[PDB]
Structure formats: structure tokens, C-alpha cells
């Protein structure tokens, strides 16, 4: 059994946001045996009202409807090994 690759992105993504704009972010793996955790600045993404995580088989989402001053850093998407990391600017 191999561990964990991220397939998408492999990049470092930055994000342009304003408070009246709906930041949906994404991260598909290799596996679909290992999902991604969505981290807010490492307290990790916690599912809200406001706050919705998608997810399907190797695919992951973060749909934030009305993205904030306060959903204004960085978000980490942790396999395992791998990370993808995804700056949002407000």
C-alpha cells in the first residue's frame, strides 16, 4: 500500500477575496482511500452554518459563501505525507 500523493493543485494557491465574494476552494488526491482535512491557520475547518465541507471519493471542498475579514488566511489541506497550501487575501 503506497501512503498519500495531493494530484491537485500542485501549486502554491493565492486567492483574491472580498467580503461580498463565495471563496470555493478544492484539492483532489491519488487516493480515494485517503481524504484531505481542511485546516483554518492549523485549528483545522469545523463544519458550521456558514461553514459547509463538501467531499466526494477523492475529491474535497471548502465552500464559504460570504467569505469574511475573518476567513482572510492561509487554509491547508492535510493528506498525510502532503499538503497543499491555499492563501486567501481579503
Same mark, same amino acid.
Given at each position: 500500500? %503506497? #501512503?498519500?500523493?495531493?494530484?491537485? +493543485? /500542485? ?12 471563496? %470555493? @476552494?478544492? *484539492? ?5 482511500? &485517503? +481524504?484531505? /482535512? ?14 459547509? @465541507?463538501?467531499?466526494?471519493? #477523492? ?5 464559504? #459563501? &460570504?467569505?469574511? #475579514? ?6 491547508? *489541506? ?13
Amino acid at each position: 500500500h %503506497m #501512503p498519500v500523493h495531493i494530484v491537485d +493543485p /500542485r501549486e502554491h494557491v493565492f486567492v483574491h477575496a472580498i467580503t461580498s465574494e463565495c471563496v %470555493m @476552494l478544492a *484539492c483532489e488526491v491519488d487516493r480515494e482511500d &485517503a +481524504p484531505v /482535512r481542511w485546516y483554518k491557520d492549523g485549528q483545522e475547518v469545523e463544519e458550521s452554518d456558514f461553514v459547509v @465541507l463538501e467531499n466526494e471519493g #477523492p475529491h474535497r471542498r471548502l465552500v464559504l #459563501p &460570504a467569505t469574511q #475579514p475573518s476567513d482572510g488566511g492561509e487554509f491547508q *489541506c492535510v493528506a498525510g505525507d502532503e499538503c497543499a497550501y491555499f492563501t486567501v487575501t481579503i
